[PDB]
């Protein structure tokens, strides 16, 4: 009923990791040609905590259930001064995602509740579909795990409005995922940094929109310290540049 030609390996991309003495994986998917490429087929399929990349499915469910009315609704800061300054202020869905404001999304999670969260992730075919742990932190220190190639599968459904939520919900999240746009490309993506449970990793998942194609990407990389957080985007763009996807 369905055909997949199989990922193609390209170890030459490891130079962009070793150049910064880093370890990780980049996965690319050419949508027009239905071809996949990665520097490490084993790590492409290794599943990790999604950490803040969970804001994508969390946003979708919150919108679809009415927990979030639209992208303008204001979520008032609760008063708790936290170590990331941009969290210590009011937010809407756009800025809550831009600044990765965990406490706003923890509230979403509590209002969604266990049963609806579990049912929706099953409908999404998201990762291992396991929400064991605190309803408001399981994507940070509980049971859910997702690999880079699984992030691509999920993102392809979101891109095509094929997830089992409303088209509007999907359009709103793709708007909030907007990260960069110029005359050559649009990037819709979400960063992540998983620290509560070993191993500490950085994530960047999303896609590059071109005039007549879309390249999906999912990367993660070992991140012992926050010093190399910028390497998530930098390494990914080096691979994009090498493959001639962006100038």
Closest CA to 231 of 17, 13, 15, 12: 17
105 binds, among ligand MER, Cl ion, none (CB under 5 to 8 A by kind): Cl ion
107: contact with ligand MER by CB under 6 A: no
Using rule CB under 6 A, residue 199 touches ligand MER = no
Q: Which residues of 155-178 are buried (b: 16+ CB within 10 A; e: fewer)?
A: bbebbeeebebeeebbebbbebbe
Using CA atoms, how far apart are residues 162 and 142, in angstroms rounded to an integer? Answer: 27
Known active-site residue 137:
no
Contact flag: residue 98 with ligand MER (CB under 6 A)? no
Residue 194 is given by DSSP the state E
Q: Does 104 bind ligand MER (CB under 6 A)?
A: no
Residue among 22, 52, 147, 169 flagged as catalytic: 52
Range 35-64, binding Cl ion (CB under 5 A): 52
* Dihedrals phi, psi of 240, to nearest 5 degrees: -60, -40
**Is 170 a binder of Cl ion (CB under 5 A)?**
no
Q: How far apart are CA 93 and CA 101, in angstroms?
A: 10
Partner from ligand MER, Cl ion, none contacting 229, C-beta within 5 to 8 A by type: ligand MER
| Contacting positions for ligand MER (CB under 6 A) | 51-52, 84, 100, 102, 140, 191-193, 229-230
Positions touching Cl ion (CB under 5 A) are 52, 102, 105, 175, 178
């Amino acid at each position: 009923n369905l055909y997949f030609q199989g990922w193609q390996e390209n170890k030459s991309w490891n130079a962009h990791f070793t150049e910064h003495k880093s370890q990780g994986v980049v996965v690319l998917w050419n949508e027009n040609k239905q071809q996949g490429f990665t520097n490490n087929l084993k790590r492409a399929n290794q599943a990790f905590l999604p950490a803040s990349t969970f804001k994508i499915p969390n946003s979708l469910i919150a919108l679809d259930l009415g927990v979030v009315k639209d992208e303008h609704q204001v979520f008032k800061w609760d008063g708790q001064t936290r170590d990331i300054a941009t969290w210590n202020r009011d937010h809407n869905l756009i800025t809550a995602m831009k600044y990765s404001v965990v406490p706003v999304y923890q509230e979403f999670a509590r209002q969604i509740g266990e049963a609806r969260m579990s049912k929706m992730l099953h409908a999404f075919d998201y990762g291992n579909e396991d929400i064991s742990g605190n309803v408001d932190s399981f994507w940070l220190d509980g049971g859910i795990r997702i690999s880079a190639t699984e992030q691509i599968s999920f993102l392809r459904k979101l891109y095509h409005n094929k997830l089992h939520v409303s088209e509007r919900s999907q359009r709103i999240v793709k708007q909030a995922m907007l990260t960069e746009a110029n005359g050559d490309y649009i990037i819709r993506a979400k960063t992540g940094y998983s620290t509560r449970i070993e191993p500490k990793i950085g994530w960047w998942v999303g896609w590059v929109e071109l005039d007549d194609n879309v390249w999906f990407f999912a990367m993660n990389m070992d991140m012992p310290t926050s010093d190399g957080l910028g390497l998530r985007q930098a390494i990914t763009k080096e691979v994009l540049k090498q493959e001639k996807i962006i100038p």
